[PDB]
Amino acid sequence: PVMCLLANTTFPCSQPPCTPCCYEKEPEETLRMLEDNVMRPGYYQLLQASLTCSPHRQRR
Amino acid sequence: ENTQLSEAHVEKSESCKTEFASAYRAHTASASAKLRVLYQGNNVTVSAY
Amino acid sequence: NFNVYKAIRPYLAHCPDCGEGHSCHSPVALERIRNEATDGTLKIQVSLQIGIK
Numbered sequence A: 001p002v003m004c005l006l007a008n009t010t011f012p013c014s015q016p017p018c019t020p021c022c023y024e025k026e027p028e029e030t031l032r033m034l035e036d037n038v039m040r041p042g043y044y045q046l047l048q049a050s051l052t053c054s055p056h057r058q059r060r
Numbered sequence B: 001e002n003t004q005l006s007e008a009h010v011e012k013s014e015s016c017k018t019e020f021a022s023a024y025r026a027h028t029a030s031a032s033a034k035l036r037v038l039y040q041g042n043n044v045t046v047s048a049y
Numbered sequence C: 001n002f003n004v005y006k007a008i009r010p011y012l013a014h015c016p017d018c019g020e021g022h023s024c025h026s027p028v029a030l031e032r033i034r035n036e037a038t039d040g041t042l043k044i045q046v047s048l049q050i051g052i053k
């Protein structure tokens, strides 16, 4: 597929540098991810990995 | 000195996925039909153009 | 499952259309209404959230 980008880091679109639980790790930087990758549906699948959230320390 | 810029535009609706009207254009039609023939004790039927 | 409403970046609105006409800080306020379903179905957007906290 195509990789997503937080303006310097070309990560896999559902696998950021903060894979997973982007909002728990970095809330306002996930908001900047929303501000930057609003064109990107793979970023929306990453958001879905925070909507059907599967964190590290949370077993769900 | 408190002001409010305000902004609006028009989009399509929720209906446009399945519920929509069609201004539609047509011209010279087609001549097809369907006929049943009794022929030698056979009520037999076909459909053609 | 499907815990989505942690990411509701607020649209915090002092509701003008509160009781008896005038305003109050109402989170139950309506923002968008859809009725164009031909079966008399009413899609109403409340400014609060249920289900997922």
Ligand SMILES: *[C@@H]1O[C@H](CO)[C@@H](O)[C@H](O)[C@H]1NC(C)=O
Pocket (backbone or CB within 6 Å): B038, B043
């Ligand atoms: C054949 O079709 C005619 C109508 O066209 C009907 O009156 C008649 O009963 C039919 N006969 C048989 C044997 O199917």
